[PDB]
Symmetry: C3
Subunit: 188 residues, 3 copies
């Protein structure tokens, strides 16, 4: 079986924009579709939450249980980015230091929210069960491993692991040759 | 949108007690609501599970995917405590040692269940993707970092991290002033 | 309350095979039930996903949020195996090296998918918030701790923790006696 919205159901959601061959589980939660833009060949699985400003490009899988909280500043994924199961991307988070009250039950003047656009560049893969914090640019071709925590931007074409992550090895660039091949074969 | 019960449907759930401005997701699961008590100004998000004896105070967010397994002994949160997404708090867990059988498919006499009330004191924050095991007090103003695991009671006003957690620095107590200031305004 | 199908409805899913005393949440997702078999005395909780080929024996709990992505090669659990909440078992994953494109939006010829059957032998327990990767045999009686990642087969009767896992101590085998004692009683 599958849990995906039909094309009929999709156009009734009211995305700021949505492309072709978009498969979106009826069991995901989509909050504020008015600020959510999605390209072509995108699949979003059961129990995902997309909230606030989120922009997804094309050829991207958001695997089950993944939450994207784009808030006002937004989360943006470029083409060929993918996010494995049970990841959270936060574009805003509370201050844990004890210098501020916390969370949605408390008015803003008492909090100290850190917020900043989160960008996943082309070919980024986030491994399962990871967390990405606000104001983070995940550079082009970065892979982060399973159970990763990323609090700061990550330099392009490396593999990172750990809590918080550290750089462990280069990511190979062959995938860019494969991208160009795949795309060329779609044009001719 | 929003996925929350109206005041009207909340009253119909049959909670032991429920305050005002309580926003519970329709995509949460609530089992045994008659032993669940929720104070005022509480938000419980999609895909949470509250099961068995659970008591939440006021000014508390239980973020999405979080499971509170209160059992008979209970989990209690005090005011201004908050739990980030994908946390589990267990009040009962099976013995992993190899000395017992395990889980809800096996009769009690064969299992060796560790159980004890769990309490999150005032101003506790539990970071995302964390697990709290039974019979523990998360002390007043403690912050536990993301992806951490707690098996013992935690001393007040520290920040802890890791699996299992260790203490890394004091929690600032400015939030106490902020609490007083806020409530006054109220 | 509880969320399970009645045995009446269980029959209308179309599992390859499904035993008695099987409690499957209505809030779990089951994909390709035709290649799923389940034994007796099994409980699968809310927000689980069972996808592709998955064979579960008897006296097993698959706790809330757990996903079992069996693909074509399959995941198999033997009797008395249990999986705690928020675990993922993968029978197929993409190559992260940069030598291949990845995931379901891309044709197979550009990918380099690692696939291989995952087997949890009798008495295996997997701790919460864990990840098991393809082509892994988790040996009889193995316990894996919470928040652990397993990429290789694990030796029988040991306890493993960490990311990726390391062996820490032997598992006690009193359970083998308990199983014998319990089966008699029936
Ligand atoms: C979205 C699309 O649909 C795709 C999918 O969903 S695929 C399904 C999801 N898949 C995953 O999440 C896979 C994640 N894979 C990993 O984490 C892999 O371990 C990895 C690619 C990051 C590294 O693997 P590999 O390159 O084989 O490196 P390996 O030799 O195993 O480990 C190198 C070092 O990192 C450590 N390490 C590896 N993975 C780690 C992790 N996730 N966290 C912490 N440490 C890790 C090892 O301990 C080792 O340290 P040492 O050098 O100090 O001994
Ligand atoms: C519920 C309400 O709605 C609120 C929300 O939901 S907010 C969204 C959820 N937010 C979160 O989960 C944030 C969690 N934050 C963290 O884990 C932060 O890292 C932290 C607050 C624990 C510590 O941050 P900070 O004080 O800036 O410490 P930092 O300098 O990064 O690290 C100190 C040490 O801890 C380590 N560390 C930090 N966080 C860690 C973690 N989560 N696990 C393990 N180690 C950690 C660092 O490696 C460093 O170790 P070293 O001194 O040995 O090098
Ligand atoms: C499905 C059925 O319904 C059953 C259930 O759902 S039960 C609910 C879910 N329960 C769980 O997930 C429980 C998981 N339990 C654990 O992870 C336990 O820590 C454990 C059983 C693996 C080990 O506990 P114990 O044997 O008491 O060992 P302990 O002394 O605490 O730790 C030994 C070493 O391992 C480390 N360690 C323990 N657990 C760890 C873990 N999960 N990850 C990494 N390190 C761990 C300790 O730091 C210590 O390290 P050191 O030797 O370097 O100091
Ligand atoms: C994980 C998942 C699968 N499915 C469906 C559609 C998928 O084609 C099918 C099996 O998917 P999956 O287990 O993701 O395997 P693959 O995509 O590698 O074949 O089940 C859903 O509808 N929603 C989900 O969240
Ligand atoms: C995450 C989440 C949001 N929502 C709704 C109510 C929220 O006001 C809105 C967005 O919430 P959220 O994404 O948490 O951001 P914020 O806390 O800044 O509002 O969508 C739910 O109903 N359930 C949920 O689980
Ligand atoms: C966790 C969970 C519980 N329940 C219901 C049925 C269970 O008998 C009841 C209590 O479950 P739980 O809180 O897991 O504890 P126990 O081991 O005592 O069963 O809640 C569900 O229906 N689905 C779920 O996912
Ligand atoms: Cl989850």
């Amino acid at each position: 079986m599958n849990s995906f919205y039909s094309q009929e159901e999709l156009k009734k959601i009211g995305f700021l924009s949505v492309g072709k061959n978009v498969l979106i589980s009826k069991k995901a939660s989509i909050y504020n579709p008015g600020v959510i833009s999605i390209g072509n060949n995108v699949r979003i699985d059961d129990f995902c939450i997309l909230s606030g400003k989120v922009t997804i490009g094309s050829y991207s899988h958001i695997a089950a249980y993944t939450a994207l909280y784009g808030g006002e500043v937004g989360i943006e994924m470029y083409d060929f980015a993918n996010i494995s199961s049970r990841t959270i991307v936060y574009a805003a988070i509370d201050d844990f230091s004890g210098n501020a009250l916390m969370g949605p039950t408390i008015p803003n003047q008492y909090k100290n929210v850190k917020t900043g656009k989160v960008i996943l560049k082309k070919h980024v893969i986030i491994g399962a069960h990871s967390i990405i914090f606000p104001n983070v640019v995940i550079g082009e071709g970065v892979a982060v491993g399973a159970m990763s925590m990323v609090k700061e931007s990550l330099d392009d074409w490396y593999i990172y692991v750990g809590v918080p992550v550290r750089k462990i090895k280069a990511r190979k660039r062959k995938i860019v040759e494969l991208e160009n091949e795949f795309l060329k074969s779609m044009n001719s």
